[PDB]
């Protein structure tokens, strides 16, 4: 028994298979002008394509669609990195495995290919994410719970200078309440399900803070490709 709201939000989910083919397609199409970028430089490229994808998801999504562009910007500027992290995390739970990271383009990559050439900062970050991904496998995190977390993340009540604030709270309390019902109806013998889900939010917020600092560092160290979206987001 999936509540009313969750079904609505559940329909705003992009075509997962389609997005992989497209981002993969762009990475290739892009490749055509250097007789070149490193592994990192490529991951960056893949990440900000994931960003374009996310913005479209929010832009034509129930509720978000009704905010003035100024509000829309304030909310996304506040949770972009956490949306990307949640996205990557949900992908590892649904598709990931053991000692292998599932990229957005659709391919698995043994952890060692990543681990081999990783520094101190990136190591702490990849480890924190690992802990979180595992905590969620442990809770049997599903898609219904996933989209709820996304909206609770998007429609944050910590963003200031918001005009239509009254609508943010509406969905916040509304999605909150939907999730509260969903978990008690689909998982009665596990009354802690709700709480554990809500407590991942602070973790997703932290990992995303770290990921931005680490990415700013890489950009200051001249490791990031000329003006990608992510860096243009960090500038704010």
């Amino acid at each position: 028994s999936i509540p009313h709201l969750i079904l609505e939000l559940l329909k705003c989910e992009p075509d997962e298979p389609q997005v992989q083919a497209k981002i993969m397609a762009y990475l290739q199409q892009e490749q055509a002008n250097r007789s070149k970028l490193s592994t990192f430089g490529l991951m960056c490229k893949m990440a900000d394509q994931t960003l374009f994808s996310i913005v479209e998801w929010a832009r034509s999504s129930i509720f978000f669609r009704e905010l003035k562009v100024d509000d829309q910007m304030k909310l996304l500027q506040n949770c972009w990195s956490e949306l990307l992290i949640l996205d990557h995390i949900y992908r590892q739970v649904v598709h990931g495995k053991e000692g292998s990271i599932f990229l957005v383009t659709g391919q698995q990559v043994d952890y060692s290919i990543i681990a081999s050439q990783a520094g101190a900062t990136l190591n702490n970050l990849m480890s924190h994410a690992q802990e979180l991904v595992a905590k969620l496998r442990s809770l049997q995190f599903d898609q219904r719970e996933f989209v709820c977390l996304k909206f609770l993340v998007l429609f944050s009540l910590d963003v200031k200078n918001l005009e239509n604030f009254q609508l943010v709270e509406g969905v916040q309390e509304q999605v909150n309440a939907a999730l509260l019902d969903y978990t008690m109806c689909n998982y009665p013998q596990q009354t802690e399900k709700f709480g554990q889900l809500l407590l991942r939010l602070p973790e997703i917020r932290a990992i995303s803070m770290q990921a931005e600092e680490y990415l700013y560092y890489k950009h200051l160290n001249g490791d990031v490709p000329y003006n990608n979206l992510l860096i243009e987001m960090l500038h704010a």
Binding site: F52, V55, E56, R59, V69, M73, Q77, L229, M233, H235
Partner: peptide
């Protein structure tokens, strides 16, 4: 943030 505005206003 011009780019973000662009992505939301675009097409």
């Amino acid at each position: 943030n011009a780019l973000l505005r662009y992505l939301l206003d675009k097409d």
